[PDB]
Amino acid sequence: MPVFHTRTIESILEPVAQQISHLVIMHEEGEVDGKAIPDLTAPVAAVQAAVSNLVRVGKETVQTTEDQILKRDMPPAFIKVENACTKLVQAAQMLQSDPYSVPARDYLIDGSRGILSGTSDLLLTFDEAEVRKIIRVCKGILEYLTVAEVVETMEDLVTYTKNLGPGMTKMAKMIDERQQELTHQEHRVMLVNSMNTVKELLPVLISAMKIFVTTKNSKNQGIEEALKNRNFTVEKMSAEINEIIRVLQLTSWDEDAWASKDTEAMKRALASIDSKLNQAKGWLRDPSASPGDAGEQAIRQILDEAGKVGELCAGKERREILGTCKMLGQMTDQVADLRARGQGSSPVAMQKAQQVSQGLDVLTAKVENAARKLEAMTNSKQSIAKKIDAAQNWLADPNGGPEGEEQIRGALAEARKIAELCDDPKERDDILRSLGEISALTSKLADLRRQGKGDSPEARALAKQVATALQNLQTKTNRAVANSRPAKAAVHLEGKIEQAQRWIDNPTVDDRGVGQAAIRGLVAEGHRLANVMMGPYRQDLLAKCDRVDQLTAQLADLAARGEGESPQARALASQLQDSLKDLKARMQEAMTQEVSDVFSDTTTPIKLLAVAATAPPDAPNREEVFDERAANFENHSGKLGATAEKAAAVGTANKSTVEGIQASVKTARELTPQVVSAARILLRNPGNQAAYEHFETMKNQWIDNVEKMTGLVDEAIDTKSLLDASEEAIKKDLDKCKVAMANIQPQMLVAGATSIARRANRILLVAKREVENSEDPKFREAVKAASDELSKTISPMVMDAKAVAGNISDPGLQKSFLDSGYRILGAVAKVREAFQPQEPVNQPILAAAQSLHREATKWSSKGNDIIAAAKRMALLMAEMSRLVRGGSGTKRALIQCAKDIAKASDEVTRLAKEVAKQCTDKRIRTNLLQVCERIPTISTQLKILSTVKATMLGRTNISDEESEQATEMLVHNAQNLMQSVKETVREAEAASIKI
């Protein structure tokens, strides 16, 4: 396949392309029409003149490198381009034979083709080994991780600190040229952040090494914390390298790393499975004592996360997951409505308590399968990748007659068979075409004996046979999982909505079971955003959950109505998309309630953790309250971090932000269990004030994180939605003064007033860090003035909090608290003023009808150069797939109109370049940086692949099974194209408000 994994191959084959572009244009009308020839042999000389630099590299690097694995393929590539160069000049001599030797003119189609069939594989083998000069370096650094592990020597650690010293200048700069090897995004952020892994963790290693230097003394008790944290470092270091090892292994747009990006959200899912499961068994321990307005969080949250495990499976059992989520909760919602009086008698409900919980534990058997249906399957991709590169070791045998190499050809063949026969629960019919490849490769085991006559050179054809018989293994192994995985709802906002969208856009022909799960997410978080509130507002949104889903379920029924669509299918689908547009804003408001309640008072238990770290814990009651403050500190980490993941679920933050908030979530998920553990280190160190003062650092080490993570999850949503619920939260608490005055409770009074400071410091925080992201400075001055008003007014409240608490029975002073009070109400929404941005219908039309409007909506006029280019975008999008379903005499406009795609997509680049320079916000221009390099690279790659399928066409006896690989490459890229292009359309308006 024509690969693009190295910019050399880009900067060589695009020089190949535009001269190849007018080459095979001459072939079609010389064969279909039989035109007169143009002058071609000197262009035939000129296209191999482009090769003449490359083939000089091609002749000399074979002479330069002794590398026999490179000699196994690169000279057979060098012969193959020479085989093309023969078929260059054999054509060119037959070009010079007659100007109408049309059977001799048949060779002309290979000249664009066999070159690009070759120069891919030619530029492969260099960059096959170019990365191999880098692979073992960082691998050796990974194998240097165990150097100081067994060794307990300080000066050896000092030399190991020198083993990383020039160890760094091997691991830094070549990787730093590797991130300059691609000026891409699609793997470069996988590189450069892993490049931050090797630099940040390196002194963190040395610190952890110096932690183990604090184990050189014997009588201390750090003999375990040194082991686990040095393990913790080297697992993180082995993570990111082996990642970017494989990120340097691949060659194009992949599928398996996405399925490898699913393995870890399984872990936060399965941890969320047994999170409230014990509390659900505790709810099962007494169902008689629950109102079901907040105790169902122990119940209904467990239901919700298994649905995403159902997003990590397929088949009929994936239908069971919606078949249990739309049922067993309604099996519990009826017994919840049996508690509207209590008329479902819980002494009588022993049969019912099973039937409301029968959707739980059978689903645990479903999710442990759907784990291991996906666990071993994504493991199988690397498992086959072991053995197919272990036949390379069989291929790189210098055994000329392999009578001794008769075992590696067999056991690996028995290894890849059973591993793909472990892939039997994927699909039953395609396991026969696996056996069809097995029945091929069993003969390819018996291929390898005629080269057994001391025959290493003439081995090469039957080596090329079993190479291509392995090149036939790869696509089925690629098909072993690409069907079995639904393309996941891209966990940001529209990337779940658009995957919810396009399943409605095509009822007859469908994806790989994807869209029946790809719509399921918008109700999967809908049941989560409806979850945590009380009685009446839960059923406010669950009606918008289950009935707007029921509006969608009519579109699921009408596949039986005829096939695909009904005659009335465009009735219920045309109002379906705005039925779910009701669902989005009531999921947003459900979310933006779930943030201003939980974050802006989270450090208040920390202060109560701090103030009960002063009073003696050697007491039965005062320590447990602190430990229930610690159990409240347990509760924050969920209701922050899950809501942070819900702020990742709906909050339209930046991709690097929803990287960075998710990265901060990781810091939230790891430093929350440590500072509660360092609280226990405090409660067990006997009178140690230094460790207490070190806990003072370590609590501050968590605060500034979670204060930044506040300010980052403040930026995970619009603050104009945050301060709505914040301006009501003070109104939810200013009244609590009026009952505090009604009784004698100054300590309940200041508890609100302290929380005002817990509110206003966060409100101080946001107007500070709006400024750094803003680039309209004449309007950030009030934002600069916002916390400035707030900083001067946070203090007299705390003065007045001390004032009224002296004697709450003092009227006037009672009024003074309100006199201090509603300046804050006059200030809190005044901050939001900055964030307030004031300063017979037809069934065969959609997937072409909704394809046009999906980037032609939003009603924009200034960026019409986006939109007018977006007109040719979706038009030629399906017209590609129309023309790849074209006849044999259609290869002219095949390449030609799809060469126009790249320059259209390079106009998509130049508009992303247009917006990014006039972008007036720093954090959102990172997604301009995460768009402005994605577009132009993959653009001309289509212009590459525009040529290839045209050369696949017009042969009329070619092997179509690889020509249809050029079909599905046109499927694959244009999918990746159209996905990011509509993103490039919509994110323009996501930036256009900022200026």
DSSP result, 257-301: HHHHSSTTHHHHHHHHHTTSHHHHHHHHH-GGG--SSSTTHHHHH
Amino acid making up residue 330: Q
**Four-residue CA torsion sign, 12, 13, 19, 23:** positive
CA distance 712 to 641: 12
Residue found by looking up tokens 């839960």 in the block: 538
CA distance 254 to 621: 58
Answer yes or no: are the C-beta atoms of 637 and 672 closer than 8 Å.
Answer: yes
Q: What one-character DSSP code corresponds to residue 255?
A: S
DSSP helix/strand/coil, 919? coil
CA distance 788 to 785: 5
Q: For residue 208, give both structure tokens.
A: 């952890």
H or E stretch covering 702: helix 689-716
Amino acid making up residue 61: T
Helices 108-130 and 41-64 pack at an angle, to 10 degrees, of 20
Reference 599, options 369, 758, 813; nearest CA is 758
CA 13 to chain centre: 30
3-class SS shares of the chain: helix, strand, coil, % to 5: 75, 0, 25
Amino acid making up residue 366: K
CA distance 248 to 182: 11
How many C-alpha atoms does 287 have within 13 Å on its Cβ side? 22
CA distance 978 to 981: 5
Contacts of 230 (CB under 8 A, 6+ apart): 149, 205, 208, 209, 211, 212
Q: For residue 191, give both structure tokens.
A: 């590189």
Answer yes or no: are the C-beta atoms of 951 and 26 closer than 8 Å.
Answer: no
Contacts of 943 (CB under 8 A, 6+ apart): 14, 17, 898, 899, 901, 902, 903
CA distance 380 to 417: 12
Answer yes or no: are the C-beta atoms of 294 and 534 closer than 8 Å.
Answer: yes
Residue 327, phi then psi, degrees to nearest 5: -120, -55
Burial class (CB in 10 A: 0-12, 13-18, 19+), 359: buried
Answer yes or no: are the C-beta atoms of 175 and 138 closer than 8 Å.
Answer: yes
**Four-residue CA torsion sign, 148, 150, 153, 155:** negative
Burial class (CB in 10 A: 0-12, 13-18, 19+), 694: middle
Reference 717, options 776, 658, 768; nearest CA is 658
CA distance 949 to 964: 8
Helices (H) and strands (E) in the chain, counts: 46, 0
**Phi-psi region for residue 606, left (φ > 0), alpha (ψ -120 to 50) or beta?**
alpha
Q: What one-character DSSP code corresponds to residue 184?
A: -
Q: For residue 112, give both structure tokens.
A: 């664009």
Residue found by looking up tokens 């596949």 in the block: 559
Q: Which residues pair with 921 in a beta bridge?
A: 774
Q: What one-character DSSP code corresponds to residue 453?
A: T
CA distance 527 to 519: 14
CA distance 407 to 390: 12
CA distance 967 to 969: 5
CA distance 947 to 558: 40
- CA angle 21–911–581, rounded 5-degree value: 115
How many C-alpha atoms does 894 have within 13 Å on its Cβ side? 28
CA distance 540 to 590: 11
Contacts of 719 (CB under 8 A, 6+ apart): 766, 770, 831, 832, 834, 835
**Structural Rg of the chain based on CA atoms:** 33
**Four-residue CA torsion sign, 104, 109, 112, 114:** negative
Kindly write down the DSSP assignment for every residue of 514-555, as one continuous string: -HHHHTTHHHHTHHHHTTSS-HHHHHHHHHHHHHHHHHHHHH
Contacts of 833 (CB under 8 A, 6+ apart): none
CA 320 to chain centre: 26
Q: Which residues pair with 849 in a beta bridge?
A: none
Q: For residue 528, give both structure tokens.
A: 């989560």
Burial class (CB in 10 A: 0-12, 13-18, 19+), 85: buried
CA distance 136 to 146: 16
CA distance 426 to 483: 8
CA distance 41 to 926: 49
Answer yes or no: are the C-beta atoms of 767 and 831 closer than 8 Å.
Answer: yes
CA distance 357 to 281: 10
Burial class (CB in 10 A: 0-12, 13-18, 19+), 103: exposed
The Cα-based distances of 135 to 158, 246, 387, 441, 670 in angstroms read 26, 10, 19, 31, 31
CA 788 to chain centre: 39
Q: For residue 958, give both structure tokens.
A: 């070619």
**Four-residue CA torsion sign, 147, 152, 154, 155:** negative
CA distance 643 to 620: 34
CA distance 883 to 888: 10
Reference 577, options 643, 504, 678; nearest CA is 504
Q: For residue 487, give both structure tokens.
A: 């393309």
H or E stretch covering 115: helix 108-130
How many C-alpha atoms does 507 have within 13 Å on its Cβ side? 25
CA distance 677 to 927: 38
DSSP helix/strand/coil, 959? coil
| CB-CB neighbours of 643 under 10 Å | 25
The Cα-based distances of 357 to 277, 281, 298, 551 in angstroms read 11, 10, 13, 28
Answer yes or no: are the C-beta atoms of 754 and 801 closer than 8 Å.
Answer: yes
Burial class (CB in 10 A: 0-12, 13-18, 19+), 398: exposed
| CB-CB neighbours of 731 under 10 Å | 12
Contacts of 379 (CB under 8 A, 6+ apart): none
Answer yes or no: are the C-beta atoms of 803 and 816 closer than 8 Å.
Answer: yes
CA distance 931 to 912: 7
Residue found by looking up tokens 């699909």 in the block: 427
Answer yes or no: are the C-beta atoms of 705 and 664 closer than 8 Å.
Answer: yes
DSSP helix/strand/coil, 686? coil
Produce one character per residue of 904-927: b if its CB has 16 or more CB atoms within 10 Å, e if not: bbbbbbebbbbbbeebebebbbbb
Burial class (CB in 10 A: 0-12, 13-18, 19+), 211: middle
Q: What one-character DSSP code corresponds to residue 888?
A: G
Which value in Å is the resolution of this experimental model? Answer: 4.5
Question: 3-state SS string over 772-807?
Answer: HHECCHHHHHHHHHHHHHHHHHHHHHHHHHHHHCCC
How many C-alpha atoms does 801 have within 13 Å on its Cβ side? 18
CA distance 534 to 531: 8
CA distance 279 to 297: 9
CA distance 159 to 418: 47
H or E stretch covering 72: helix 68-95
Answer yes or no: are the C-beta atoms of 658 and 924 closer than 8 Å.
Answer: no
| CB-CB neighbours of 142 under 10 Å | 18
Cα first-last separation, the chain: 44
CA distance 391 to 413: 9
Contacts of 698 (CB under 8 A, 6+ apart): 674, 675, 678
**Phi-psi region for residue 959, left (φ > 0), alpha (ψ -120 to 50) or beta?**
beta
Answer yes or no: are the C-beta atoms of 298 and 282 closer than 8 Å.
Answer: yes
DSSP helix/strand/coil, 24? coil
CA distance 232 to 14: 45
CA distance 953 to 955: 6
CA distance 712 to 706: 9
Residue 492, phi then psi, degrees to nearest 5: -80, -170
Residue found by looking up tokens 């950030």 in the block: 780
Answer yes or no: are the C-beta atoms of 931 and 987 closer than 8 Å.
Answer: yes
Helices 7-21 and 108-130 pack at an angle, to 10 degrees, of 170
**Phi-psi region for residue 577, left (φ > 0), alpha (ψ -120 to 50) or beta?**
alpha
Q: For residue 944, give both structure tokens.
A: 């590459």
Contacts of 936 (CB under 8 A, 6+ apart): 905, 906, 909
Q: What one-character DSSP code corresponds to residue 486?
A: P
CA distance 782 to 67: 67
Contacts of 151 (CB under 8 A, 6+ apart): 157, 160
CA distance 951 to 573: 41
Residue 860, phi then psi, degrees to nearest 5: -110, 150
CA distance 783 to 777: 9
CA distance 936 to 932: 7
Residue found by looking up tokens 């739980």 in the block: 360
DSSP helix/strand/coil, 342? coil
Produce one character per residue of 412-442: b if its CB has 16 or more CB atoms within 10 Å, e if not: bbebbbebbeebeebbeebbeebeebbeebe
CA distance 241 to 198: 9
* Experimental technique behind these coordinates: cryo-EM
Q: For residue 805, give both structure tokens.
A: 């608490």
Answer yes or no: are the C-beta atoms of 2 and 119 closer than 8 Å.
Answer: no
DSSP helix/strand/coil, 183? coil
DSSP helix/strand/coil, 607? helix
CA distance 166 to 161: 9
Contacts of 905 (CB under 8 A, 6+ apart): 935, 936, 938, 939, 942, 977, 981
Give the number of residues written for the chain: 995
CA distance 979 to 983: 6
Q: For residue 979, give both structure tokens.
A: 């996905």
CA distance 441 to 435: 9
Longest pairwise C-alpha distance within the chain: 114
